[PDB]
């Protein structure tokens, strides 16, 4: 009914630029729907849906400022896109220029199909070398 996948770039450098795609995913809905919901399981930037701070896997102090969205997403805690089509593509991007501490960053994203729904989660890891 509802399947979600997320795929990293798979050899990051330390210097990131605004908009740099760090990961890509899709949501598939096979039952009738009017749209898609997507959210990242990460701390959100204050009052700004779609924008997140991802922490390091072993470092705590290592942070990555990142945003969701590709085409037509919007603020309704989570962001939303309309469509009856079977699937959407979405991107996780570097939010402004930044210098990432080396290490590992786990992106974790959950999605719903829009008709009280059940969300599936997908995760991808990036390594800043």
Numbering used by the authors: 0 to 9, 11 to 76, 82 to 120, 130 to 143
Task: Kindly provide excerpts from the paper associated with this entry.
In EAEC, the minor subunit of AAF/II (AafB) has been associated with the release of cytokines, suggesting its surface localization and function in EAEC pathogenesis. At the same time, based on the fact that minor subunits of AAF are 12–23 residues shorter than major subunits, we hypothesized that they do not possess their own donor strand sequences and are stabilized in the fiber by strands donated by major subunits. The minor subunits AggBdsA and AafBdsA have more similar structures than the major pilins: 117 matching Cα atoms are superimposed with r.m.s.d. of 1.2 Å. The donor sequences derived from the corresponding major subunits form classical donor strands (Gd), each inserting five donor residues into the subunit core structure. As predicted, the minor subunits have no N-terminal extension that could act as a donor strand: the first residue in the mature protein is structured and immediately followed by the first strand A. Hence, this structural evidence suggests that the minor subunits assemble by accepting donor sequences of the corresponding major subunits. As such sequences are only available in tip subunits of major subunit polymers, the AAF minor subunits are likely to be tip localized. In minor subunits, strand A is not split between the β sheets, but locates entirely in the sheet 1. Instead, strand C2 that in a classical Ig fold is hydrogen bonded to strand F, in minor subunits is hydrogen bonded to strand D and hence belongs to sheet 2.
In the fiber, subunits are linked together by donor strand complementation (DSC) with an N-terminal Gd donor strand segment of one subunit inserted into the hydrophobic cleft of a neighboring subunit.
